[PDB]
């Protein structure tokens, strides 16, 4: 399937989403959106796009979408999506960018909506002009399950563990440099105090 | 089991001899973490939990969990002289022995994890030439999808946190480094200016 190793992040930012769940109350949450593009393990010629909706506050919350260069004609059909596969992530980004920048008094107002109906969920980005609500994109996401959330958290962990390692390396290098500057400052202060004595010389 | 009020008593990699049914024997370095706390349901019930994981296989997990109550069965089915409070200490010293063991040693302390599928047995053995004498033998359950999920979410928030702290120190360190360079440059300026004031004043007084 999809190899999160050879993957490329195109977008990875929190977006203000209106989450609507089945027997729970409507809530405005800030959810993380990551748009990934790569290939299939089985066939290195099959391009795939992956989208993840997660929360930094709920580490178990996850919603996923996955479409190959092939199956894109199915998704494109029924939706009316004018754009091709290569163009698709760009259409998604600009729309999520509009939602990010939306301000209270706005009209037309761009709003992201995630409707959770048990084992399936629908993500839409809508343009709200007073009464009328016009959708720019409507997508089909699958929530959970235990096996998928498990793999995601293992990916996230190795990822954070890695950026942690890099931070540690810079801190070492920075601390080493700071220590060298103090030695140089002390030597300069010594030269300065010695020159002052050499000034007397009376 | 309260993971909020929990306490880590041990947390280190130990060299373990992993034996699996249908696979070849392997010497791996596995992470051991010993925690003690209480039950969510009853704040009066003391519990001990031990996790065996790998930094190389993020899905590998084997767990052991015993409450102050359940200890007596574990104690009888073993001959363990020590009480519940004393038990983690017995485990630690044995894990230290395995950690410090060197190749040519005899008596040599060795950690062994046997996987039969659905169940796994962890033992710490003393090897004096031929004879192998076990000091501890424990029953571990390999983690399922739901248990591995919770573990990785715990690990992630934990690393995400120590990552934040590292970032803060790097900011503070970088700020200090930048200030030292400014101080060094100012000192070098003062030094060059004094030199001109000296040179001139000595030429002038002639």
Numbering used by the authors:
A (entry chain B): 15 to 216
B (entry chain A): 16 to 221
Authors' text:
Here, we demonstrate that the centriolar protein SAS-6 forms rod-shaped homodimers that interact through their N-terminal domains to form oligomers. Proteins of the SAS-6 family comprise an N-terminal domain with the evolutionarily conserved PISA motif, followed by a segment with a predicted coiled coil and a less-conserved C-terminal region predicted to be disordered. Furthermore and in conclusion, because these residues are well conserved among SAS-6 orthologs, we propose that the self-assembly of SAS-6 homodimers into a 9-fold symmetric ring structure is a fundamental property at the root of the universal 9-fold symmetry of centrioles.
To investigate the structural organization of the Bld12p N-terminal domains in the context of the two-stranded parallel coiled coil, we produced a fragment in which the crN variant was extended by the first six heptad repeats of the Bld12p coiled coil (crN-6HR). AUC experiments conducted at 150 μM protein concentration revealed that crN-6HR forms higher-order oligomeric species. However, a mutant in which F145 was substituted for glutamate (crN-6HR[F145E]) formed only dimers, as revealed by AUC and MALS experiments. The asymmetric unit of the crystal revealed a dimer (denoted the crCC-dimer hereafter). Dimerization is brought about by interactions between the two α3 helices, which establish a parallel, two-stranded coiled coil through knobs-into-hole packing of the residues occupying the heptad a and d core positions. The relative orientation of the two N-terminal domains is maintained by predominantly hydrophobic interactions formed between residues of their β3-β4 loops and residues from both coiled-coil α3 helices. Having the structures of both the crN-dimer and the crCC-dimer of Bld12p allowed us to build a structural model of higher-order oligomers using both dimer interfaces. Strikingly, when crCC-dimers were associated such that their N-terminal domains interact as observed in the crN-dimer, we obtained a ring with a 9-fold symmetry (see Experimental Procedures for full description of the modeling).
